[PDB]
Amino acid sequence: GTENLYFQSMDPAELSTQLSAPGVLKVFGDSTGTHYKSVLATGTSSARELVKEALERYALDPRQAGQYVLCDVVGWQARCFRVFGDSEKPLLIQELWKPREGLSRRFELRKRSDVEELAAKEVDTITAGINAQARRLQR
Ligand SMILES: [Cl-]
Ligand SMILES: [Pb+2]
Ligand SMILES: [Pb+2]
Numbered sequence: 101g102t103e104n105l106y107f108q109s110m111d112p113a114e115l116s117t118q119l120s121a122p123g124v125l126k127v128f129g130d131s132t133g134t135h136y137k138s139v140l141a142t143g144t145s146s147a148r149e150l151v152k153e154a155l156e157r158y159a160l161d162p163r164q165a166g167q168y169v170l171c172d173v174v175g176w177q178a179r180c181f182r183v184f185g186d187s188e189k190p191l192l193i194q195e196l197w198k199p200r201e202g203l204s205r206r207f208e209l210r211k212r213s214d215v216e217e218l219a220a221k222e223v224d225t226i227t228a229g230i231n232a233q234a235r236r237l238q239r
Contacts, residue, residue, distance in 0.1 A: 102187045119143040123191045127154045127170070128208045131178060141191040147184035154209045169215060173206045174199050181208070183215060 107115055121143060126136040127150075137157040139150060152165045170190060173181035184190055190207065199205045 102185060103189075104185070104187075105189055105192060118192070123194075125150065125190060125194070125207055127157075128173075128206050129158070130208065130210055130214065134176075143189055143192045145189065145191055146186060147188045147190055148186040150190055151209065158209065167212055169210055169212050171208045171210050171215075173208045174203045175206060176204065178206070178208075179203065 107118065110118075119142065123141045123143075125139040125141050127139045128134075128136045137154065139153050139157060141150060141153075147170045148165070151168050151170050152162045154170070155162050155165055155168060170184045171181045172184065172190075172193065184193075194205075194207075
């Protein structure tokens with residue numbers, strides 16, 4: 101519905117398999133573990149559908165699916181990540197885009213509220229850093 105992946109100049113056959121071919125996605129947690137649960141997908145599976153499958157498979161309750169989020173995490177120590185929008189197609193993004201040379205990739209299930217608290221956290225590490233720089237200078 102808010103889909104932002106598009107294929108161009110393609111043929112029905114290569115495009116139908118691209119979207120109908122099955123795949124497994126290894127879905128990790130925050131890093132509560134180094135252990136992953138394999139999640140079944142196709143090129144049509146949305147991030148929201150795949151969050152639901154992931155929670156079901158973690159033995160958590162899919163009712164709270166809407167309060168979790170799938171993340172494309174580059175890192176093994178995590179360094180940066182991107183939150184999938186609900187309508188995105190993670191199986192296809194997996195195929196087509198990859199970590200910069202040196203880094204490696206993990207899809208992680210994560211609670212929204214843990215994501216926003218991580219934004220707040222990085223605003224504070226920037227801001228602290230600026231108030232540190234400032235104090236050094238004026239004294
Ligand atoms: Cl339950
Ligand atoms: Pb499309
Ligand atoms: Pb977890």
